[PDB]
Curated annotation (Swiss-Prot), chain A:
One of its GO terms (biological process) is DNA-templated transcription. The N-terminal domain is essential for RNAP assembly and basal transcription, whereas the C-terminal domain is involved in interaction with transcriptional regulators and with upstream promoter elements. It catalyses: RNA(n) + a ribonucleoside 5'-triphosphate = RNA(n+1) + diphosphate. Homodimer. The RNAP catalytic core consists of 2 alpha, 1 beta, 1 beta' and 1 omega subunit. When a sigma factor is associated with the core the holoenzyme is formed, which can initiate transcription. This is DNA-directed RNA polymerase subunit alpha 1. The chain holds residues 8 to 230 of 323 of the full protein. The keyword Oxidoreductase does not apply.
Curated annotation (Swiss-Prot), chain B:
This is DNA-directed RNA polymerase subunit beta. The chain holds residues 1046 to 1097 of 1358 of the full protein. The gene is rpoB. Belongs to the RNA polymerase beta chain family. Signal peptide: none annotated. DNA-dependent RNA polymerase catalyzes the transcription of DNA into RNA using the four ribonucleoside triphosphates as substrates. The RNAP catalytic core consists of 2 alpha, 1 beta, 1 beta' and 1 omega subunit. When a sigma factor is associated with the core the holoenzyme is formed, which can initiate transcription. It comes from Francisella tularensis subsp. holarctica (strain LVS).
Length: 223, 52
């Protein structure tokens, strides 16, 4: 009378879709692990994103550069949809971008400094109708979502600074299903992310958080 | 651009100087605003629930 699960990355597919699995379970506890995984995976996982940007010859968001089919606010909206991957202990740094081309400024043209990563290499940032200079920065920061209310407005210092709101959590869909195997079951969790993390690491992290939160009820003491 | 009255208006005599200021602000929807589909149904946004 002893069952304990191990985790397996079976059935990859699609853009960034996966189907992680935990093979043996306790015949009844499956539907607990499923719900806990889902909810904690949808609310607390932290990533990194752009939060503040400064363009070269601009003063505010409702403006317009020359020879650019785009606008400033359209550009700021483009920037929000970039998928950035940061390493273990960076937690804040700066990105740079300076170009003198005459086409479409994709996000691949960010400076390939250390630590950073730019997964969404196809995403346009701006379209230059004619050849010209173009430059900016963007402070990338770790973070997690907290709700539209308890968010600090991210103080600005320089003149051209322009706050950019940031959606951190890299998870887009979760769904589980539980299968019976006879005195035992197997859990089959779907995950889909932006590609900024690996699935196995993700689910392991979520269960770590969850058990960390449970570990008070083993004591019935304060902390 | 200079065929004005040297101050851009007749100034409605008695007025020395005036200035116009233009301020812009984004606004997001919040508990209390009023939505309505095209079919005559309407209501007031009552809460905002977390994704999960």
């Amino acid at each position: 009378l002893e069952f304990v699960p191990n985790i397996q990355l079976k059935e990859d597919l699609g853009a960034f879709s996966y189907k992680v699995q935990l093979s043996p379970v306790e015949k009844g506890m499956a539907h607990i692990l499923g719900n806990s995984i889902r909810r904690v995976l949808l609310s607390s996982l932290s990533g990194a994103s752009i939060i503040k940007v400064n363009i070269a010859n601009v003063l505010h968001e409702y403006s317009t550069l020359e020879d650019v089919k785009e606008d400033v606010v359209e550009i700021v909206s483009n920037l929000k949809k970039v998928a950035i991957k940061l390493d273990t202990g960076i937690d804040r740094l700066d990105l740079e971008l300076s170009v003198n081309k005459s086409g479409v400024v994709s996000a691949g043209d960010f400076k390939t400094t250390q630590g950073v990563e730019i997964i969404n290499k196809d995403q346009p940032i701006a379209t230059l109708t004619n050849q010209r200079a173009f430059s900016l920065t963007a402070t990338v920061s770790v973070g997690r979502n907290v709700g539209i209310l308890s968010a600090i407005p991210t103080e600005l210092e320089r003149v051209g600074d322009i706050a950019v709101d940031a959606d951190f959590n890299p998870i887009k869909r979760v769904a589980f299903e539980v299968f019976d195997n006879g005195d035992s079951e197997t859990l089959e969790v779907f995950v889909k992310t932006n590609g900024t993390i690996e699935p196995l690491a993700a689910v392991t992290k979520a269960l770590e958080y969850f058990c960390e939160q449970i570990s008070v009820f083993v004591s019935l003491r304060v902390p | 651009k200079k065929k004005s009255i040297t101050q851009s208006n007749e100034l409605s005599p008695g007025v020395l100087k005036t200035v116009k200021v233009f301020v812009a602000i984004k606004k997001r929807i919040q508990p209390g605003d009023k939505m309505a589909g095209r079919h005559g149904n309407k209501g007031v946004v009552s809460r905002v629930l977390p994704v999960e």
